Design an enzyme around this catalytic site. Structure first.
Site, PDB file in Angstrom:
ATOM      1  N   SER A  45      34.481  43.860  31.188  1.00 31.32           N
ATOM      2  CA  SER A  45      33.041  43.845  30.986  1.00 31.32           C
ATOM      3  C   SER A  45      32.557  44.925  30.027  1.00 31.32           C
ATOM      4  O   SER A  45      31.381  44.890  29.646  1.00 31.32           O
ATOM      5  CB  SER A  45      32.309  43.990  32.319  1.00 31.32           C
ATOM      6  OG  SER A  45      32.634  42.926  33.221  1.00 31.32           O
ATOM      7  N   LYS A  48      30.683  43.895  26.927  1.00 31.86           N
ATOM      8  CA  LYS A  48      29.295  43.469  26.940  1.00 31.86           C
ATOM      9  C   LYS A  48      28.449  44.351  26.017  1.00 31.86           C
ATOM     10  O   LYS A  48      27.378  43.926  25.528  1.00 31.86           O
ATOM     11  CB  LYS A  48      28.735  43.481  28.359  1.00 31.86           C
ATOM     12  CG  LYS A  48      29.143  42.229  29.175  1.00 31.86           C
ATOM     13  CD  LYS A  48      28.688  42.303  30.619  1.00 31.86           C
ATOM     14  CE  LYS A  48      29.013  41.023  31.389  1.00 31.86           C
ATOM     15  NZ  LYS A  48      30.481  40.867  31.676  1.00 31.86           N
ATOM     16  N   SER A  92      26.745  43.297  35.108  1.00 38.66           N
ATOM     17  CA  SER A  92      27.950  42.730  34.493  1.00 38.66           C
ATOM     18  C   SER A  92      28.031  41.240  34.783  1.00 38.66           C
ATOM     19  O   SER A  92      29.030  40.739  35.297  1.00 38.66           O
ATOM     20  CB  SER A  92      29.233  43.425  34.969  1.00 38.66           C
ATOM     21  OG  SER A  92      29.061  44.810  35.150  1.00 38.66           O
ATOM     22  N   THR A 183      30.808  49.746  33.263  1.00 43.08           N
ATOM     23  CA  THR A 183      32.024  49.534  34.035  1.00 43.08           C
ATOM     24  C   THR A 183      32.701  48.245  33.604  1.00 43.08           C
ATOM     25  O   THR A 183      32.058  47.318  33.107  1.00 43.08           O
ATOM     26  CB  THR A 183      31.751  49.469  35.540  1.00 43.08           C
ATOM     27  OG1 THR A 183      30.919  48.338  35.822  1.00 43.08           O
ATOM     28  CG2 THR A 183      31.076  50.732  36.033  1.00 43.08           C
ATOM     29  N   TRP A 185      36.323  45.730  35.036  1.00 44.26           N
ATOM     30  CA  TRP A 185      37.339  45.517  36.074  1.00 44.26           C
ATOM     31  C   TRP A 185      37.992  44.163  35.811  1.00 44.26           C
ATOM     32  O   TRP A 185      37.470  43.136  36.246  1.00 44.26           O
ATOM     33  CB  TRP A 185      36.739  45.565  37.468  1.00 44.26           C
ATOM     34  CG  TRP A 185      37.771  45.575  38.572  1.00 44.26           C
ATOM     35  CD1 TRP A 185      39.099  45.247  38.472  1.00 44.26           C
ATOM     36  CD2 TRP A 185      37.557  45.946  39.937  1.00 44.26           C
ATOM     37  NE1 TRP A 185      39.714  45.388  39.687  1.00 44.26           N
ATOM     38  CE2 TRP A 185      38.792  45.819  40.603  1.00 44.26           C
ATOM     39  CE3 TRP A 185      36.440  46.373  40.660  1.00 44.26           C
ATOM     40  CZ2 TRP A 185      38.938  46.105  41.956  1.00 44.26           C
ATOM     41  CZ3 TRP A 185      36.587  46.656  41.998  1.00 44.26           C
ATOM     42  CH2 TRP A 185      37.826  46.520  42.635  1.00 44.26           C
ATOM     43  N   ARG A 225      35.672  54.109  40.482  1.00 44.93           N
ATOM     44  CA  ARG A 225      35.591  54.511  39.088  1.00 44.93           C
ATOM     45  C   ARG A 225      34.503  55.554  38.885  1.00 44.93           C
ATOM     46  O   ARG A 225      34.665  56.461  38.066  1.00 44.93           O
ATOM     47  CB  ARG A 225      35.357  53.291  38.202  1.00 44.93           C
ATOM     48  CG  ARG A 225      36.536  52.336  38.144  1.00 44.93           C
ATOM     49  CD  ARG A 225      36.103  50.935  37.755  1.00 44.93           C
ATOM     50  NE  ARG A 225      34.813  50.554  38.321  1.00 44.93           N
ATOM     51  CZ  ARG A 225      34.249  49.368  38.130  1.00 44.93           C
ATOM     52  NH1 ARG A 225      34.770  48.488  37.291  1.00 44.93           N
ATOM     53  NH2 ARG A 225      33.136  49.059  38.795  1.00 44.93           N
TER      54      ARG A 225
HETATM   55  C1  LIG Z   1      33.689  43.005  34.230  1.00 44.70           C
HETATM   56  O1  LIG Z   1      34.589  43.777  33.930  1.00 44.70           O
HETATM   57  C2  LIG Z   1      34.045  42.162  35.443  1.00 44.70           C
HETATM   58  C3  LIG Z   1      34.457  40.771  34.949  1.00 44.70           C
HETATM   59  C4  LIG Z   1      35.983  40.657  34.884  1.00 44.70           C
HETATM   60  O2  LIG Z   1      33.901  39.759  35.802  1.00 44.70           O
HETATM   61  C5  LIG Z   1      32.920  42.159  36.491  1.00 44.70           C
HETATM   62  C6  LIG Z   1      33.419  42.161  37.951  1.00 44.70           C
HETATM   63  C7  LIG Z   1      33.198  43.575  38.505  1.00 44.70           C
HETATM   64  S1  LIG Z   1      32.140  43.604  39.927  1.00 44.70           S
HETATM   65  C8  LIG Z   1      30.557  42.885  39.581  1.00 44.70           C
HETATM   66  C9  LIG Z   1      29.412  43.859  39.856  1.00 44.70           C
HETATM   67  N1  LIG Z   1      28.300  43.043  40.231  1.00 44.70           N
HETATM   68  C10 LIG Z   1      27.206  43.476  40.527  1.00 44.70           C
HETATM   69  N2  LIG Z   1      26.137  43.973  40.833  1.00 44.70           N
HETATM   70  C11 LIG Z   1      32.504  44.254  37.373  1.00 44.70           C
HETATM   71  C12 LIG Z   1      31.984  45.623  37.352  1.00 44.70           C
HETATM   72  O3  LIG Z   1      30.775  45.814  37.651  1.00 44.70           O
HETATM   73  O4  LIG Z   1      32.749  46.563  37.008  1.00 44.70           O
HETATM   74  N3  LIG Z   1      32.373  43.507  36.370  1.00 44.70           N
END
Ligand SMILES: *C(=O)[C@H]([C@@H](C)O)[C@H]1CC(SCCNC=N)=C(C(=O)O)N1
Length: 239
Positions: A45, A48, A92, A183, A185, A225
């Site tokens: 992500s 982005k 994200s 972030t 992941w 993180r």
């Molecule tokens: C981005 O790196 C990922 C992608 C692979 O889908 C998404 C999943 C996680 S958790 C989503 C957080 N949601 C909400 N409030 C992340 C992240 O936030 O690191 N991004």
């Protein structure tokens, strides 16, 4: 300022990674796996940041547009709502950026990514997923420079577009300090890779950019993180 103590928070959270600090084009390494700093990874992500910049600058969207949720189920319930680019960034929300990416299209995406020289600068053929499963890859030192430039408005985009994306990225505000960052992941590749790339905007206006990269596994809380990063910036006395 040590370097050995930062090894021990990395030591104990039973992970493998590196924290890259850039203070005015000087790069320092910290963690328990400093070799990670020069190995290519999918950006997840954190792409982005560059997706938004490309989309805004080419007028495929704008910071006011509301992306309509058309009812299909998404990976998280927080994503199942209308939202702007910036709200999608803070959460994200892949589907919004996938839609954006499909507007940019492959030619424009590939041309911009290599003009920026982002990582290995390869997006392959599927415009809407190259930042999650390849073939786009980037080292964490390359990510600290990218976000460094973004922080100083030095990226090869207009300044208003850059400033727009930067206001999308404010994470904390405490003691005259500001932390910006994104972030990532990648959960669908083995071993999993987690990202937290950004910069600290110290009260005097100074800027210190960071790129935390670490191996990831399904059970850790997402705040791992942030925990690792925050107490390293306090140890280095950047905050
Ligand atoms: C981005 O790196 C990922 C992608 C692979 O889908 C998404 C999943 C996680 S958790 C989503 C957080 N949601 C909400 N409030 C992340 C992240 O936030 O690191 N991004």
């Amino acid at each position: 300022g040590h370097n050995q103590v930062i090894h021990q928070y990395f030591d104990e959270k039973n992970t493998s990674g590196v924290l890259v600090i850039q203070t005015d084009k000087k790069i320092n390494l910290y963690g328990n796996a400093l070799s990670r700093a020069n190995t290519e990874y999918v950006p997840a992500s954190t792409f982005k940041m560059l997706n938004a910049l490309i989309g805004l600058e080419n007028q495929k969207t704008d910071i006011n547009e509301i992306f309509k949720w058309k009812g299909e189920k998404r990976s998280f319930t927080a994503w199942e709502k209308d939202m702007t680019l910036g709200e999608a960034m803070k959460l994200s929300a892949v589907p919004v950026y996938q839609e954006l990416a499909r507007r940019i299209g492959l030619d424009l995406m590939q041309k911009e990514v290599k003009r920026i020289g982002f990582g290995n600068a390869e997006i392959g053929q599927q415009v809407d997923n190259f930042w999650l499963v390849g073939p786009l890859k980037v080292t964490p030192i390359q990510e600290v420079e990218f976000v460094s430039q973004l922080a100083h408005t030095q990226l090869p985009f207009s300044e208003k577009v850059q400033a727009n994306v930067k206001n999308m990225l404010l994470l904390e505000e405490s003691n005259g300090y500001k932390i910006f960052g994104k972030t990532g992941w990648a959960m669908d590749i083995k071993p999993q890779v987690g990202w937290l790339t950004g910069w600290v905007e110290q009260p005097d206006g100074k800027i210190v950019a960071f790129a935390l990269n670490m191996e990831m596994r399904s059970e850790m809380p997402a705040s791992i993180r942030n925990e690792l990063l925050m107490k390293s910036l306090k140890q280095l006395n950047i905050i």
